[PDB]
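Key idea: predict the complex, not the pieces.
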Amino acid sequence: GGAGHVPEYFVR
Amino acid sequence: GGAGHVPEYFVR
Amino acid sequence: CGTPISFYC
Amino acid sequence: CGTPISFYC
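Result:
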């Protein structure tokens, strides 16, 4: 959901 | 604005 | 190239 | 939360 210290969109 | 290993969107 | 790019916070 | 995010390939 943004630009944080934990991932959101990691790999593909 | 893409993938990579050098910064393009730093803290703003 | 191939890393997390959009994150949570 | 202060990480620099997107990159250059």
